[PDB]
Design an enzyme around this catalytic site. Structure first.
Site, PDB file in Angstrom:
ATOM      1  N   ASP A 184     -34.079 -11.465 -55.362  1.00 57.02           N
ATOM      2  CA  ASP A 184     -34.293 -11.026 -53.854  1.00 57.02           C
ATOM      3  C   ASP A 184     -33.504 -11.836 -52.852  1.00 57.02           C
ATOM      4  O   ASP A 184     -33.527 -13.093 -52.978  1.00 57.02           O
ATOM      5  CB  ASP A 184     -35.728 -11.275 -53.519  1.00 57.02           C
ATOM      6  CG  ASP A 184     -36.779 -10.241 -54.161  1.00 57.02           C
ATOM      7  OD1 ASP A 184     -36.550  -9.401 -54.642  1.00 57.02           O
ATOM      8  OD2 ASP A 184     -37.950 -10.415 -53.734  1.00 57.02           O
ATOM      9  N   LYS A 207     -35.996  -1.641 -50.907  1.00 55.18           N
ATOM     10  CA  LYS A 207     -37.390  -1.055 -51.320  1.00 55.18           C
ATOM     11  C   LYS A 207     -37.548  -0.110 -50.171  1.00 55.18           C
ATOM     12  O   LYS A 207     -36.947   0.099 -49.142  1.00 55.18           O
ATOM     13  CB  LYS A 207     -38.345  -2.196 -51.243  1.00 55.18           C
ATOM     14  CG  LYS A 207     -38.239  -3.297 -52.358  1.00 55.18           C
ATOM     15  CD  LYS A 207     -39.351  -4.314 -51.966  1.00 55.18           C
ATOM     16  CE  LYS A 207     -38.832  -5.493 -52.694  1.00 55.18           C
ATOM     17  NZ  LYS A 207     -39.307  -5.234 -54.055  1.00 55.18           N
ATOM     18  N   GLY A 243     -45.130 -12.210 -55.681  1.00 53.50           N
ATOM     19  CA  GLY A 243     -45.239 -13.560 -54.631  1.00 53.50           C
ATOM     20  C   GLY A 243     -46.330 -14.461 -55.065  1.00 53.50           C
ATOM     21  O   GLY A 243     -46.748 -15.082 -53.981  1.00 53.50           O
ATOM     22  N   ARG A 283     -47.034  -6.660 -72.290  1.00 55.27           N
ATOM     23  CA  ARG A 283     -47.598  -6.498 -73.754  1.00 55.27           C
ATOM     24  C   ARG A 283     -48.195  -5.253 -74.102  1.00 55.27           C
ATOM     25  O   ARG A 283     -48.057  -4.589 -74.856  1.00 55.27           O
ATOM     26  CB  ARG A 283     -48.482  -7.705 -73.940  1.00 55.27           C
ATOM     27  CG  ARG A 283     -48.042  -9.135 -74.459  1.00 55.27           C
ATOM     28  CD  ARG A 283     -49.075 -10.102 -75.287  1.00 55.27           C
ATOM     29  NE  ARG A 283     -48.682 -11.097 -75.587  1.00 55.27           N
ATOM     30  CZ  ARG A 283     -47.707 -11.514 -76.916  1.00 55.27           C
ATOM     31  NH1 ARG A 283     -47.652 -10.506 -77.545  1.00 55.27           N
ATOM     32  NH2 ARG A 283     -47.570 -12.790 -76.962  1.00 55.27           N
ATOM     33  N   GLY A 307     -44.017 -12.679 -60.357  1.00 51.41           N
ATOM     34  CA  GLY A 307     -44.464 -13.851 -60.744  1.00 51.41           C
ATOM     35  C   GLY A 307     -43.618 -15.024 -61.731  1.00 51.41           C
ATOM     36  O   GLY A 307     -44.143 -15.789 -62.406  1.00 51.41           O
ATOM     37  N   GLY A 315     -37.915 -13.692 -57.331  1.00 51.95           N
ATOM     38  CA  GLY A 315     -38.272 -13.446 -55.799  1.00 51.95           C
ATOM     39  C   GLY A 315     -37.428 -14.760 -55.116  1.00 51.95           C
ATOM     40  O   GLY A 315     -36.517 -15.391 -55.617  1.00 51.95           O
TER      41      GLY A 315
END
EC number: 4.3.3.6
Lengths: 264, 264, 264, 264, 264, 264
Positions: free
Chosen positions: A19, A76, A148, A160, A209, A230
């Site tokens: 980002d 986006k 975030g 998974r 994350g 991010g």
């Protein structure tokens, strides 16, 4: 074979998408070896605290990013906001991310992505959801993770879940795949193709994350074909160094000596 | 005879493992007669107090501790974070603690610890949980207690629950051990072995909430073979004295005269 | 290498075991090509209609069947009735069926089948149950189906449950097998062996509600390695012909012209 | 031929109605090409943040707006406040908006709009509600959207609900339209006319949460025949330019190059 | 285009299929102008009262019907009983009815009908269910109605449900069809084809509870392409007369003078 | 002015309609001064008593009644059975009763009665239901009462509910009639018309549970314009007398002397 937007992200595989909120961040991303950048005006970490409505970024801001790099630029749109997408497509972005990070514009329907030339990335937390995005025309899937926060655990669960269900379809008795498509709430034709191929019909990246080199490499070792990260990678002090470390950890995800060195 | 990583902590038995955030704390620990130190950048009392995501410590920080002492050094990874563990193994830590004190990276699966040469410590609150950790390759089990609170009562409950169930298996009719393994949710082979030996297959230590010399000796008298203590010891004012008191209490746990003297 | 009573039913694979209530039935079973006979005094359809407690059959009745045939003789004990099994073993039965068709003698615990020389068959409706019976020493597993009703649908369910979960383990990510063993409530060592081999550790037969040649062949095509059939075979019309038709259907389970001819 | 106030907003179709709080705003609205202005004293975002009862605006304020522009002026009354509407009608407003943005004056009953000469706009979130407003005499329907938040998603929902149910009536078997009117809680005569014509009996505009040119064009592409926009248009930066950009977007709602340019 | 077994029932359209339990009933059916007969050993009306397990009929019985007529002969299998189907296919029946009238053999999975040359009829109560049968290979759909009761009301509900949803898809905004496929729990590719074509991908007949000529004609006027009727048409006294009246009412369903004459 | 089939039963007002199962019952009815007869093969007391499906009567049976009398003849169809009605219309019955006494053919939709020239009678228990039947084309409304029970109390409740709501509309504030139509689930146009006229738009008769002369006159005094009675009248022993008593009670409903005499 089922109708799928195939092979539209080959150059991104093995890579990191970063980002970026400024052309300066964009150049740091490119010099670090990013495969693409995601142009945005306001960060998932600031969206998460500040909280107005979050929309498509200003087209001037996105052009300023495009002008700054040679690698692909994504941007986006709000879920279901097919006019924000019509606008982005004429700007010449290379990918549109129909993103849950922004304030959805339609609570029920996603964008009919077959109405576009430009490829779309969409998020998923499980294989059924991934297949429904692909049925609508998505050319790439990423996990949603938890945007975030810097906490990789939700991305672990997503990767998974998607990968575990692909594995379960591959060994499943063929006559049970009709009911499996019903339970996944996914089109049978794509469920049957994943059972035969053992792969999602489009490339699968992790997002949400990923904070450290160890996180990125872990998502690759879980089947990710590439990662999104991010702008915190910029906000934390030696931005050239941090960006480069995540690129190397994604490329050399299976080498623990590399991961130890880039983590120092 | 079941697959277990046996005998990997014989040199720690009878001892105290101390959390340390600096090489100086590490030297005080080793001077006080600690059997190992646990390197970490921020403590269970500050994690509970601040929050945010808690991860594996910076590898330079850990290497600083390894350089400062002769005794074994441990360090933590997030539950399920097998790539944090890959990194720690190349650092040459002596043990990895797959720790519930940090933010879990995988809410369903723990690390497959058989993929490592370095031994792991895992937490448990009951015998079923201890056995599942061992099944995955753990080389030592500790109680979870209640981390960074100074309240020993969770640790008492854990030690009594694990010891109480080991005792119950030892005298159980052998034909009932199949159903016992089902109720414990643990592998029959390890249940049967506990029932014959009257011992956990690997060393059991106590952690979580040990604040005073009396707490440490009480956990030893409840069957702990050693104890972990938090960096609270160094937050206290005459750290050489507090650290040495807890070591002597753990060596001399059965001597009320020594326990009175070191509590003075 | 997990502890399992392996390879004790090699001679029965591909065959039909028939319930028999008299030496004459036992003769017809054997001349029809049955691989074994199940000696019992009172039939599952008789137990299902009339009340009362159902136990091990009179040893004289079982001995009358042993003397009448050359093929193996099995007979039933109540679940958990280890003394009924001690008695049958001294009679020289070839197999003991610890059978949910009789009235259970222990509602919590099955027989510890390791205390015996003679092999046991036990019932299962899902893979976890099958693995718990094997862990107690069972040498063969059969489906429970729904006994004495002639409705094959419960057997279909069990056969698909067991084989579906074996398939799911074979493609599962190895690091998830520990949680899989906890969810199946089965010993990890048996779970991991099923994941590697793609097969149950012992032979799997179908039982319960198999009425016609088509049923028997359907169960073989779902992965059964042999079938049990009830004494209804005798109870109707030309018993030599009905028994031969089921043996042929089970042998030639993949041949629709053979199956059509024997269905007449 | 059902009783409906038809054809009273022909001159507004395709256009933008702007909320205005001063004669200067009303001038900017009109020079920007608005088709009408909505005169109000206090804005929906002000009502949404501060407490208090919100009523018809001071007639002097509304008269100040009428004197300032040549295009039609609308103004609001509380739901069910037929006397507020009697007063506005004598002021010579062109339309009265019976508006859920104000504090309702009657929680059960709307104004009987047949008692008036002046036409009314009423809000709706689904087709049944729209038809009940028309049955009471409304001359125009707008979506409720979510007023003063800038989040277009509620408007998307309403526009899709209304247009989706119109489409469903057009292909419905005629004999099922009686039950459809009962389920919509709408007059059959209006339901049957919608089924035959494929259109609402009066003009349908979007309102509520339209913030950007992309939003306005998205609502037109969902079937809106015009849009209402809030005084946020004024509240930010160069108001002449922001108002002209929305008028242009609404006019050229299908032209992505026009929409990209006005989004800058 | 989606994979569907198309055009396999053209000669049956406009026709009646009659259940027959004897070659005499079969000849009465054919002389009445039936398009096909359904061979069965035991009736839905006797299945409904008597209630054993109901299975595939004896192949000798079905051959005796085939030998008696020149029109196509269908016969039934239990749901999920793919071996009963393997048997019927070698007998040379013209259609297999995977029928809920019989005792299901699999509670979860239907037959994978792509494994056959012979076409299958399957039942449905709503469009989602019809599409899932067709996805599995069905070449014709019939309503389930309520078998062997003579009460047409459930068939009315089924035919209005299937036909009402086809109509709703035809007028639906294209971008909402992805969610419609999810809500129908049907493959998108078939949902999109029904939206485009306005027809089910295979022929749709009514079955279940058609007792009189007025019933049959009503099911045709609701969109049925043909009808199934039960053997009660034989059990009621002037079997030539009753069978002929239903054939004429199905052919001339829109002529009330015909329907009055054949109802006398 | 709303669409209603008005004035179609003027010759029946003030009269009794009698159920008849034979031409002889029909002649007695007409001799007793019945205004019409209702032809049916089996009675509401035998339907309630036996069950099975109840349908339109054999057309020959109905024509037998039409041939036996000069007065109008009605006959029943199943709710929603528009093809039974097509058949009856060609028979030349004077009215069709779409009757809840028979087994419903459509549990959701009533017949679209506008597709017919012949007038229909429909049942109602409240004014909302009466209005929906009229909206569909009904030419007469009757109470449902409780059919074949001889208990008048349901009919009393129906007549008071329909009359009570008509009264309530007549004095209701006109602005509240929109919400009244919504709460009645009935078309506003017919609600408004009832509010102005104080009358149902078509004739209202009473049926269901009228056993004695006193019952019949009570329903007239509650606003019925005529009554239906069951074939109970002929089951009673001196049928000419019972039939004539009910006719005189209905003509002379306001004269207690006549009511006493005909009850003697």
């Amino acid at each position: 074979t089922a109708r799928v937007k195939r092979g539209m992200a080959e150059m991104l595989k093995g890579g990191v998408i970063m980002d970026v909120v400024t052309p300066e961040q964009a150049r740091i991303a490119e010099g670090a070896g990013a495969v693409a950048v995601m142009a945005l005006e306001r960060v998932p970490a600031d969206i998460r605290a500040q909280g107005g409505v979050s929309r498509m970024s200003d087209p001037d801001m996105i052009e300023g990013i495009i002008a700054a790099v040679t690698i692909p630029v994504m941007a986006k749109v709000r879920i279901g906001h097919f006019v924000e997408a019509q606008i982005l497509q004429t700007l010449g972005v290379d990918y549109i991310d129909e993103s849950e990070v922004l304030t959805p514009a339609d609570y029920a329907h996603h964008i009919d992505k077959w109405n576009f030339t430009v490829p779309f990335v969409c998020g998923a937390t499980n294989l059924g959801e991934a297949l429904r995005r692909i049925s609508e025309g998505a050319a790439m899937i990423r996990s949603k993770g938890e945007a975030g926060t810097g906490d990789v655990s939700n991305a672990t669960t997503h990767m998974r879940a998607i990968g575990g269900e692909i594995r379960r379809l591959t060994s499943m008795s063929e006559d049970e795949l009709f009911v499996a498509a019903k339970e996944l709430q996914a089109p049978y034709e794509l469920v049957a193709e994943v059972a035969r191929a053992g792969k999602l019909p489009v490339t699968l990246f992790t997002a949400g994350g990923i904070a450290t080199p160890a996180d990125a490499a872990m998502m690759m070792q879980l089947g990710a074909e590439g990662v999104f990260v991010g702008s915190g990678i910029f906000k934390s002090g030696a931005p050239e160094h941090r960006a480069a470390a995540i690129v190397k950890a994604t490329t050399f995800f299976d080498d623990p000596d590399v991961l130890a060195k880039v983590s120092r």
